[PDB]
Ligand binder design. Structure first.
Ligand SMILES: O=C(O)/C=C/c1ccc(C(=O)O)cc1
Ligand SMILES: O=C(O)/C=C/c1ccc(C(=O)O)cc1
Ligand SMILES: [Cl-]
Ligand SMILES: [Cl-]
Ligand SMILES: [Cl-]
Ligand code: NA
Length: 129
């Protein structure tokens, strides 16, 4: 599923991400836009052989099991395929664990390079929330 911008903002808010560890909703929407273009089915292979999955491009190196990332962990205790569902629940719950781990949203390099310090509230402008 490819979410609309305000559609995804609504789904993220419903799931508790708005100001989760201090990150306003627009941070999350911005990260999703640049990670996946709002497409729940997005996958991207990393140089080290891990893969990033879903709307927030969660990596198999640490967070999910895909059965093909040697030496990795599965800290969210999920198959990476669950991160590709039209229902964002698994992505959101695993994102909460990630963002809580010490580095905040800097875990998402695209957030740090394209959203951090920007007018992220623009990502939710006009949305009914
Ligand atoms: O970018 C690039 C992506 C490579 C890639 C690898 C596995 C599944 C999807 C994509
Ligand atoms: O334009 C472009 C830049 C930023 C931006 C942010 C939120 C919604 C639309 C655009
Ligand atoms: Cl915001
Ligand atoms: Cl594995
Ligand atoms: Cl933080
Ligand atoms: Na893994």
């Amino acid at each position: 599923k490819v979410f609309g911008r305000c559609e995804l903002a609504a789904a993220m808010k419903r799931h508790g991400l708005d100001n989760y560890r201090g990150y306003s909703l627009g941070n999350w929407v911005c990260a999703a836009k640049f990670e996946s273009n709002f497409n729940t089915q997005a996958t991207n292979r990393n140089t080290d052989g891990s893969t990033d999955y879903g709307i927030l491009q969660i990596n198999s190196r640490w967070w999910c099991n895909d059965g093909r990332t040697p030496g990795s962990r599965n800290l969210c205790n999920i198959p990476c395929s669950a991160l590709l569902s039209s229902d964002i629940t698994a992505s959101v719950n695993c994102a909460k664990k990630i963002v809580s781990d010490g580095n905040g949203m800097n875990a998402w390099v695209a957030w740090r390079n394209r959203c951090k310090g920007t007018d992220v509230q623009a990502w939710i402008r006009g949305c009914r929330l």
